From Swiss-Prot, chain B:
Full protein name: Vacuolar-sorting receptor 1
Function: Vacuolar-sorting receptor (VSR) involved in clathrin-coated vesicles sorting from Golgi apparatus to vacuoles. Required for the sorting of 12S globulin, 2S albumin and maybe other seed storage proteins to protein storage vacuoles (PSVs) in seeds. May also be implicated in targeting N-terminal propeptide containing proteins to lytic vacuoles.
Tissue expression summary: Mostly expressed in roots and dividing cells (at protein level). Also expressed in seeds, seedlings, leaves, stems, flowers, siliques and pollen.
Domain comment as written in the entry: The tyrosine-based internalization signal may be involved in trafficking at the trans Golgi network (TGN).
Lineage: Eukaryota, Viridiplantae, Streptophyta, Embryophyta, Tracheophyta
Shown segment, full-protein numbering: 20 to 178 of 623
Amino acid sequence: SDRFV
Amino acid sequence: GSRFVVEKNNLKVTSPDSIKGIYECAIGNFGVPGTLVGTVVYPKSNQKACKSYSDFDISFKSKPGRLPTFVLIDRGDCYFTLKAWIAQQAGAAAILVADSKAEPLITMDTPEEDKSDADYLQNITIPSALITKTLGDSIKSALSGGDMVNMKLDWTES
């Protein structure tokens, strides 16, 4: 569930 | 996989009565400092915080004796870390990033940046949280009607 954008 | 493996924290909307309550949020993986009470603002311009607010002559610094400003920011078009830096530079006391789609909360991660843009990652101090589209829409509706939206942030679980 990790996102940069 | 592991779509629900998110570091969740509770926040409390304390006003208006129509949306008061406890909501889940996801604290960003950066710039964690405690409890802070503030009032939510959704800017009319630069709503994704991808450009400097100084270019718009917009400041979120609170006047003496008033609640610190939590700026509501839309997801999209730039890194979450840049949004938090830009809100920080504009004087916001915290940033709430409203997810652009209705989905489980996500963890705002730190990107791998060019050497020319690596140092600001170390300098982010303001608390940053991702909130659902549903809560973001609820806050925006309250503000557009003229209500004051106050909120208590808790990062003690982080």
